[PDB]
Structure 1
Amino acid sequence: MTEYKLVVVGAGGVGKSALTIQLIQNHFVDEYDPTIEDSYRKQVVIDGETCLLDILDTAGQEEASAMRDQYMRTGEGFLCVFAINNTKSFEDIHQYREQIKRVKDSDDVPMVLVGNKCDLAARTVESRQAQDLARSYGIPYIETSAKTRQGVEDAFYTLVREIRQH
């Protein structure tokens, strides 16, 4: 059993915790309880190989923005999450991307771009704009709903595959 260290990052309120709890417990969290730092474990078979996912769920509120280097050092792959009805959260993605690259001193960090809340009709970030950004990073783009489970396994398990092939 290989162990994988995944880290979920992105602006406050985009659904990092809801995505993680949906993956771990098959439950959608309606409350908005801002995270400081939480961690979860999940044994799961991916492409026929059993592994153990360690998932770090991080703080998106700006008041915690000076405490990120410590978790970026330990992570092996990053889910970069924005919400498709929140343009500012999309504009915040590049700041996370650049900080991860700096901390890990690498242009080649496993990452997946995640556009969450895709169950909501009132989209303000178009798929094409997010896909263009993902291509510029060399990473896949996956739209998700923590509420319906759409895309959730795909997002996390795609990240595992990119760590595996790293």
Structure 2
Amino acid sequence: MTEYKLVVVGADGVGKSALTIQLIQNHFVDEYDPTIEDSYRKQVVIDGETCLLRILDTAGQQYMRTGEGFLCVFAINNTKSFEDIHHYREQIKRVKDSEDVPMVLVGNKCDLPSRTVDTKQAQDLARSYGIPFIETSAKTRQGVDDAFYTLVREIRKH
């Protein structure tokens, strides 16, 4: 079966572990050790296709050169994580030695009212990279499937 290796990157505390657990395990984690950096697998039906998703959930503390898709995650109530989005894009290009990496920018925690990063603000950065932008909430599952599935399709075009 078609297997897709996805990599979740972004500053700590933006919800990288919660988005994977919501997608894979279908529930919301209130806490997840920031130093756990593991793979997580689940067979899914994307637009109606049996794909095997191998997701690597990264941490500050498991190969990324082999990842074919990267979700770049910040939180809408964390400017600092939005400002660091550029560092991870440069690390993706470095580790893949190409400026043509299938990639999706994700604004997590959009269930929170104390928002700082604006939508057009994130959309402008997305058009800067030529990549889609999807607002997600690991707590409500909002856009969670759309974030990951868009990446596979971005892989499917590449």
Common fold by TM > 0.5: yes
- SS of the residue corresponding to residue 6 of structure 1 reads strand
State yes or no: 1:127 paired with 2:128.
no
Q: In the aligned structure 1, how far is the partner of 2:23 from the partner of 2:65?
A: 24
Q: Give 4+ residue runs of structure 1 displaced > 4 Å after superposition.
A: none
Q: In the aligned structure 2, how far is the partner of 1:32 from the partner of 1:152?
A: 18
Report the Cα offset of residue 103 of structure 1: 1.5
Once superposed, what is the RMSD of the aligned Cα atoms?
A: 1.2
**Cα contact 1:117–1:146 (8 A) shared by 2:** yes
Q: In the aligned structure 1, how far is the partner of 2:147 from the partner of 2:111?
A: 16
Q: In the aligned structure 1, how far is the partner of 2:155 from the partner of 2:60?
A: 23
1:26-47, Cα deviation, whole Å (9 max, x unpaired):
1100114213311100101112
TM-score normalised by length of structure 2: 0.96
Corresponding residue number in structure 1 for 2:20 = 20
Q: In the aligned structure 1, how far is the partner of 2:32 from the partner of 2:64?
A: 24
TM-score normalised by length of structure 1: 0.92
Report the Cα offset of residue 149 of structure 1: 0.4
| Bigger shift: residues 150-159 or 70-79 | 70-79
**Cα contact 1:17–1:35 (8 A) shared by 2:** no
Q: In the aligned structure 2, how far is the partner of 1:28 from the partner of 1:95?
A: 28
The structure-2 alpha-carbon separation of the partners of 1:71 and 1:162, relative to structure 1 and needing over 3 Å to count, comes to same
Report the Cα offset of residue 71 of structure 1: 3.0
Residue segments in structure 1 that go unaligned for 5+ positions in a row: 62-69
Report the Cα offset of residue 118 of structure 1: 0.3
| Bigger shift: residues 15-24 or 36-45 | 36-45
Report the Cα offset of residue 115 of structure 1: 0.3
Q: In the aligned structure 2, how far is the partner of 1:50 from the partner of 1:35?
A: 31
Residue segments in structure 2 that go unaligned for 5+ positions in a row: none
Identity of aligned residues (%): 92
- SS of the residue corresponding to residue 5 of structure 1 reads strand
1:84-125, Cα deviation, whole Å (9 max, x unpaired):
000000011100001111111101000000000000011011
| Bigger shift: residues 26-35 or 119-128 | 26-35
How many residues get paired?
158
Report the Cα offset of residue 60 of structure 1: 4.0
